[PDB]
Each structure stands twice: as structure tokens, then as C-alpha cells.
Amino acid sequence: AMGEITIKLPDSVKVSTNSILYKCGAKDLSVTYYNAGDISLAKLELEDETVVASNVISGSGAKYAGSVYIWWTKGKTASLYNLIDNPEEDKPISCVEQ
Amino acid sequence: MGEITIKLPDSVKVSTNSILYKCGAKDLSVTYYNAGDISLAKLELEDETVVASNVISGSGAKYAGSVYIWWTKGKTASLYNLIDNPEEDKPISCVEQ
Numbered sequence: 738a739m740g741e742i743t744i745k746l747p748d749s750v751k752v753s754t755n756s757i758l759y760k761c762g763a764k765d766l767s768v769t770y771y772n773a774g775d776i777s778l779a780k781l782e783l784e785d786e787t788v789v790a791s792n793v794i795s796g797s798g799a800k801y802a803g804s805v806y807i808w809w810t811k812g813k814t815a816s817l818y819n820l821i822d823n824p825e826e827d828k829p830i831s832c833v834e835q
Numbered sequence: 836m837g838e839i840t841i842k843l844p845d846s847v848k849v850s851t852n853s854i855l856y857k858c859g860a861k862d863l864s865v866t867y868y869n870a871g872d873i874s875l876a877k878l879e880l881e882d883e884t885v886v887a888s889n890v891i892s893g894s895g896a897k898y899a900g901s902v903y904i905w906w907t908k909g910k911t912a913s914l915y916n917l918i919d920n921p922e923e924d925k926p927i928s929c930v931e932q
Contacts, residue, residue, distance in 0.1 A: 741842055744886065751836050
């Protein structure tokens with residue numbers, strides 16, 4: 738019906754948006770990060786669906802949860818976990834920031 | 836800037852609805868944003884605003900964002916604080932108004 742999710746915050750909050758290309762083995766993954774204060778969201782443009790995950794607490798790196806996925810970055814690397822196919826969360830897909 | 840805008844394919848209908856909860860004596864407004872399988876929840880808590888995303892669960896609708904888990908079932912909800920209560924055993928209970 739409409740091309741957009743709009744989330745309105747206090748007008749004083751600066752919002753940044755940046756798209757980053759990742760390479761997962763031979764495959765490209767486009768991820769967009771939306772940052773507003775402590776709020777951080779990642780739009781993952783996956784093969785069959787688009788997921789919007791939220792940054793959640795972790796010991797290290799920046800971890801995001803959305804739908805059946807965990808997306809977890811550290812440095813120039815990232816791991817994509819699929820909790821349906823791999824509920825053990827031990828066999829993730831590795832990606833490198835371009 | 837005041838607003839997060841996330842672009843999606845043009846035929847995706849995005850619905851936005853806010854729901855008032857009461858957690859004991861305290862008010863809590865949650866706005867839900869749904870678009871396809873994407874479900875986000877802005878929680879305007881007492882001292883902070885967070886955005887959680889719907890994540891897989893066995894029952895009800897579970898959302899995770901920041902240090903919180905927000906889990907609705909029917910007319911009720913629980914708010915988990917993984918800092919104050921990492922054990923995840925003392926959630927705050929809320930009812931939809």
C-alpha cells in the first residue's frame with residue numbers, strides 16, 4: 738500500500754542511515770543500519786525475504802534479532818544464524834564487509 | 836531528525852497502530868509497525884524509548900530490542916529486563932487497555 742515504515746521519535750533525536758554491502762562466500766548481502774540514540778535496526782535483504790532486526794544485548798560485537806534470524810557483527814565480519822534450520826546456533830553463515 | 840524511515844518494496848502495505856498498556860499502576864504505550872512478516876514494536880517506557888523486532892517463539896508474539904523482551908499473549912504482556920533480571924524470571928506484567 739505504501740513503500741515505507743516510518744517510526745516517529747522525539748524531534749531532537751538525530752537519525753543516521755547507512756547501507757553496507759557484505760559478501761557471504763560467493764553471495765552478496767545488502768544490509769541497511771538505522772541508528773537513533775541507543776536504538777539500532779538492521780534491514781537484511783535476504784534471498785527470499787526482507788527482515789528488520791533490532792540490536793539486542795550481547796557480550797561483544799553488535800548483535801541483531803529479527804524474525805527467525807540473528808545477525809551478529811564484529812569488526813569487518815558478520816554471522817547470519819537461522820534459528821529454524823539451525824536452532825543450535827552453531828553453524829552460521831559468515832560474511833565480510835565490503 | 837526525529838524519524839526512522841525504512842524503505843520496502845512498493846506493494847508492501849505498512850500498518851501502524853498504537854496500544855496503551857497498564858503495568859500495575861504504570862502506563863506504557865506501544866506502537867506496532869507491521870509490513871509483511873516484519874513486526875516492530877516501539878516501547879515508550881517510563882524513562883526510555885526502545886524499538887524491538889518480532890522474533891521466533893513457541894507461543895504469543897515475542898519482540899526483542901536493546902536489553903528488553905516484550906512478549907504479548909492475548910490481552911496480556913510481559914516485559915523482561917535482561918540487565919535488572921538476566922535470570923529472566925521476574926518480568927513486569929501488563930494488560931492491554
